Amino acid sequence: SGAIYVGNYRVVNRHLATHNDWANLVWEDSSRDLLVSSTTAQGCDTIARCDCQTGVYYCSSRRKHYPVSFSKPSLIFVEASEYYPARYQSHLMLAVGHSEPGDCGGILRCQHGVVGIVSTGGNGLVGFADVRDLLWLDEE
Ligand SMILES: Cc1n[nH]c(C)c1S(=O)(=O)N(C)C
Ligand SMILES: [Zn+2]
């Protein structure tokens, strides 16, 4: 599990979005595994605007933050998970690292702030859904 709390927005994995998230829906994209919903309180996280390929991610299934190198946001093919089939996914970044289904939502962060959230796992790879292209997250 895990979310980004930027201003009055909540950024979650589409596949972990709650009824409350869908009832307060701002934006959602199955191809990115992202959903954004409205909050009443302001959040404590800030979003990276950058092309960094190094950062640190939280891995719940190890209670550990790992420094990683990761690919630039891309269109990757993903093998079947407990929560999705084998399929393609967009705006995905890959690193070498541990990712189990429940690690989804872990933040990846660089020197500029939050880069994305864990979205995929398997074969000693962790995939992150990028949020850095979501400039609209900064305002309104
Ligand atoms: C960055 C971006 N904009 N539009 C798409 C599609 C993407 S992508 O990350 O999916 N791509 C580079 C493969
Ligand atoms: Zn950065």
Swiss-Prot record:
Zn(2+) 1 binds at residues 50, 52, 110, 112. It catalyses: Selective cleavage of Tyr-|-Gly bond in the picornavirus polyprotein. Disulfide bonds: none annotated. The active site is at 15 (for protease 2a activity), 33 (for protease 2a activity), 104 (for protease 2a activity). Cysteine protease that cleaves viral polyprotein and specific host proteins. It is responsible for the autocatalytic cleavage between the P1 and P2 regions, which is the first cleavage occurring in the polyprotein. Also cleaves the host translation initiation factor EIF4G1, in order to shut down the capped cellular mRNA translation. Inhibits the host nucleus-cytoplasm protein and RNA trafficking by cleaving host members of the nuclear pores. Counteracts stress granule formation probably by antagonizing its assembly or promoting its dissassembly. Homodimer. This is Protease 2A. It comes from Coxsackievirus A16 (strain G-10). The chain holds residues 869 to 1008 of 2193 of the full protein.
